[PDB]
Amino acid sequence: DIQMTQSPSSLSASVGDRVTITCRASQSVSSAVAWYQQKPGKAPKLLIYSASSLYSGVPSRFSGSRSGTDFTLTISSLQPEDFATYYCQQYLYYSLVTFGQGTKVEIKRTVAAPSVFIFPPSDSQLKSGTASVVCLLNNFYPREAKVQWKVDNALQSGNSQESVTEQDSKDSTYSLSSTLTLSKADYEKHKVYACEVTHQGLSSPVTKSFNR
Amino acid sequence: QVQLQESGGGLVQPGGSLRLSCAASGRTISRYAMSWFRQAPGKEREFVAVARRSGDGAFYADSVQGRFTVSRDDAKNTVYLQMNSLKPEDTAVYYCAIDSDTFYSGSYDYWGQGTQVTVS
Amino acid sequence: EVQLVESGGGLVQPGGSLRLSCAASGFNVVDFSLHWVRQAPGKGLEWVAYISSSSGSTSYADSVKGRFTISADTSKNTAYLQMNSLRAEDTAVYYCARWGYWPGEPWWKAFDYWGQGTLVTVSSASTKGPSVFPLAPSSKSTSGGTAALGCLVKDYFPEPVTVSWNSGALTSGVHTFPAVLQSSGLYSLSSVVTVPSSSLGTQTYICNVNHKPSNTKVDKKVEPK
Amino acid sequence: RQFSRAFVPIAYSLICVFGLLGNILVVITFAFYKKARSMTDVYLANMAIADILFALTLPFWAVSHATGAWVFSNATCKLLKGIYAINFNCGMWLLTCIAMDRYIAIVQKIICLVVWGLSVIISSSTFVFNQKYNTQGSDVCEPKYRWKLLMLGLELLFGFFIPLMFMIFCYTAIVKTLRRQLADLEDNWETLNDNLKVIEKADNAAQVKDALTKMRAAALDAQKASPEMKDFRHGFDILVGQIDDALKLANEGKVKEAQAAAEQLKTTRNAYIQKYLERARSTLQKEVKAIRVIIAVVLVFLACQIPHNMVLLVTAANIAYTKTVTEVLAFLHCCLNPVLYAFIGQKFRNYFLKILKD
Ligand SMILES: Cc1cn(C)nc1[C@H](Nc1c(Nc2ccnc(C(=O)N(C)C)c2O)c(=O)c1=O)C1(C)CCCC1
Ligand SMILES: O=C1CO[C@H](CNC(=O)C2(c3ccc(C(F)(F)F)cc3)CC2)CN1C12CC(C1)C2
Q1: Domain of D113: which CATH number?
Q2: D253, D282, D311: which is the final residue of a domain?
Q3: Cβ distance A155 to A148 under 8 Å?
Q4: Which domain does B42 fall in, by range?
Q5: Which burial class, exposed, middle or buried, applies to C218 when counting CB atoms under 10 A from its CB (0-12, 13-18, 19+)?
Q6: Is C38 in a helix, a strand, or coil?
Q7: Residue D19, phi then psi, degrees to nearest 5
């Protein structure tokens, strides 16, 4: 019944920056809050125990502080190994441990506009009876971008699935793939197929379309 | 009912500085996001910088990294853009845009008339 | 060192049963309480259950009460988590963590040593090969500069698939998207390549889809129209 | 205004003799009690030494006021302003190192000579300033009129902006520290007592598990707020070692056996917790009353010698009753310190009655 709210959902900073992550409990949880670091594809690791004492093995750049029910994890100098997910957790009792929503620490980068491509389905899939139209957004930053589908100048909902790749090793950007999956008789009823994208690095929304 | 007005600009010597101010009436600057755009007389609308709510940070483009700095004022409901180490290639009209989406999608609809910044 | 491993993870049908093992080596179960922490794919961590071996006290979370059964075995230094009636929200990775006993400092080090955990996925579909379709480089899309290619797989049931491009000779520019789950209970994945358009007619592009659970290797070509 | 100079000096002589008697009493009580000599004790002792340095020469001020004008040479008046200046700045820097030591004692010989050296620097800067300006036919001794004024201005800026705001910061930090520490022992005793009444009223709708988790959080904080130090921490290990014992039985639905382990909650609360929560309350209330002595000797040093100093600067840069009411205020502070020690300072009230009953 104790809820912990982690305030920064996504956090962006570069190497050498000082970052802070705040968590707030519903009731008092005393000084029993731990901070876990989870790399993608790995088990979490304990960084801070009892909200102030760093664990034996972790580097000394990680610190913790408590102010009433407000807990704070501060990294004074960011490192390339410090980019991971961070969880706040109260541990007042064995049967009442609740974790935070998580904070993803990404790499601060220059804003790049997405490269927008549209792929109509090949005849093979069309002949199958179920057609999928792809709208690819390549090499953009930050993550927050939206794609909408305007079939015959009409918006669509519930028929598009988006898959987002994480940060690359070289340029550290994002890439999106919006797949609209629909039947054969509904596709042959329409002519204009467009995907329109909006991004924070983009002045006017980019619409890529075809006619089939 | 949302209007937006910008100040600053003029003629700046190369290597100089400027501090533009962008303020909107009829809508609070807080809880939304602020963005700055360049428009050259011969080129297309180029991106400069974007400011988020409170303290998630600000993001600048590949040409204005280090030189430019964005500050926010939710109490005064305005934003400031500080330009340092100028170049004659930076001569452009500076438009000020506001993100309508809370999730920073990029719904850029309420533009402004902008100020002209020119070099030498 | 003292360490914990997990086992028993796999694929079950909805309404089935599964018992994960949790083997602890180097330390005894009667000195440290053992917990199962659940991470849904792409979502945050969530605690499930705990067992105290000395006092015999077990407890569950609210979403898993009655359906889940936790146990321990001091003779093999193992802890077992038995699940019945696994609904569609129960597909996740399960981690087995240790925790000290009050009083003293081991109670303060909450979840100090973790295990790697196991993936438990529930679904009603059966193993089948992917269907590969070419995402053609349309010539009007950025003519004279760089274009984008790709081959899309649509309906394949197990997660681990491997997409290679030109038999591993292409590494720069390939973006292989994470697989999403459709409404039909299967997985769709896309792997796109950005090439310069001057080498479209000269160079050929081949994608190899490798699906070891179905033993299916598809070499489908991509060509502009 | 002959009656002003006629009615100052008998009062000046009486506060002079009272101040010198009281401060020489203070130094023989240090000369007898040299065992519990705290850093507060030696800092206020050096303040007393500056006070008896100032205390001898108010008869010179009294016979200067009684004759209607100054009698002695200008060097005597320069020495009188110098000893008033070393009294003021000795008090300032001694209360500054008082703020130093109470900050480093609460929040977490050589410096006396440093205070004396800063005092004699102030004495030099008022030595180069003082001259008998016989204005309007009366040979009064008032300092009045480029680098010297700027040096005095920067010294005033340093010795007013740093130590006064330092007093404000450190004393507000202390009275927000020692009040919150006393507050933190209040709600920890409250929810350990209030929620124990909820447990005995929790046979209705299973509010047992909600109740002890509030006590689990509070009694962990009270443990965090030597053989005697071992008993302080150990008294809370069985207190929450029977909270989770009444929470293990609360998870299984044994509400009746949760109340049986709730009867053992009061037993450790009286035998281990109420003994040490009262013992910590008396020690916390003892140190918050010694602050009230330190606050009072600071706040009256800025209510007596400061408004006389701010009226000396405006009358030197460029209403005589405003000058007259301030000229009796700072000179009253030499005798006013032993007045404040008996009726506020609880330590001095003990041995003063012991000396009277010796
Ligand atoms: C009689 C005597 C014998 N001796 C050894 N010291 C005294 C007096 N000392 C006194 C206080 N001292 C403290 C006040 C506040 N705080 C702390 C403290 O913080 N600690 C931690 C103890 C104090 O020492 C009084 O009040 C008070 O009178 C004098 C120096 C001043 C008057 C006579 C000589
Ligand atoms: O005649 C004396 C005898 O010594 C006093 C002592 N005063 C100071 O030592 C200091 C002081 C503090 C506060 C204030 C106030 F105005 F703000 F109240 C003024 C001065 C620290 C410098 C000042 N003078 C003066 C007149 C010119 C200064 C020589």
Answers
A1: 1.20.1070.10
A2: D282
A3: yes
A4: 3-103
A5: middle
A6: strand
A7: -70, -40
Which residues does C39 contact at the CB level (< 8 Å), separation at least 6? C45, C46, C92, C93, C95, C117
Closest C-alpha to B98, from B56, B53, B57: B53
Q: What is the DSSP string of D166-197?
A: HHHHHHHHHHHHHHHHHHHHHHHHHHHHHHHH
Two tokens, residue C208: 């190899």
Q: Closest-lying ligand to the alpha carbon of D35?
A: 1
Residue D26 CA: nearest ligand 1 atom is 33
Binding pocket residue ranges, ligand 1, CB within 6 Å: D 26, 29-30, 33, 36-38, 40-41, 44-45, 290, 293-294, 341, 345, 347-348, 351
Mutation choice for A interface testing from D188, D191, D213 by most A CBs within 10 A: D213
Neighbors of chain A with 3 or more C-beta pairs under 8 Å: B, C, D
Residue B41 to residue A132: CA distance in whole angstroms: 42
Decide: B and A in contact? Rule: 3+ Cβ pairs under 8 Å. yes
The CA-CA-CA angle for residues A115, A121, A122, to 5°, reads 120
Asked, for residue B81, whether it belongs to a domain, the answer is yes
Residues in chain B: 120
D and A in touch (3+ CB pairs within 8 angstroms): yes
Last residue of a domain, one of D223, D254, D282: D282
Closest by Cα among C213, C55, C194 to C127: C213
Residue D152 domain-assigned (yes or no): no
Nearest to D87 by CA among D57, D44, D124, D50: D50
Helix or strand (DSSP H, E) at C92: strand C92-99
Same domain for D137 and D263?
Answer: no
- Contact A28/A66 with Cβ under 8 angstroms? no
DSSP per-residue letters across A64-132: EEEETTEEEEEESS--GGG-SEEEEEE-SSGGG-EE---EEEEE----BPPEEEEEPPPHHHHHHTEEE
For residue D178, the CA-to-ligand 1 centroid distance in Å is 20
Give chain B's domain count: 1
- Ordered structural domains, chain C, with CATH: 3-122 (2.60.40.10), 132-222 (2.60.40.10)
Which residue among A107, A128, A161 closes a domain?
Answer: A107
Beta-carbon separation of A28 and D210 below 8 A: no
Q: Does C107 touch chain D (CB under 8 A)?
A: no
Q: Which of A39, A124, A136 to mutate to test the interface with C (most CBs of C within 10 A)?
A: A136
Domain that residue A73 falls in: 4-107
Residue D331: CB within 6 Å of ligand 2? no
Look at residue B76 and tell me if it is in a domain.
yes
d(CA C51, CA D178) in angstroms, rounded, equals 43
B111 within a domain of the structure (yes/no): no
Residue D205: CATH number of its domain: 1.20.120.10
**Ligand 2 nearest-atom number relative to CA D92:** 21
Our CA angle for A104, B62, B110, nearest 5°, is 80
- Stated in angstroms to one decimal place, the resolution of this structure is 3.3
Whats the size of chain A, residue-wise?
212
The CATH number covering residue B95 comes to 2.60.40.10
Structural domain for D232, as ranges: 179-282
> In terms of domains, do D265 and D304 share one?
no
How many domains, chain D? 2
Q: How far apart are CA D274 and CA D265, in angstroms?
A: 12
Give the CA angle between residues A137, A140, A144 to the nearest 5°. Answer: 90
Residue matched to tokens 């499930």 = C48
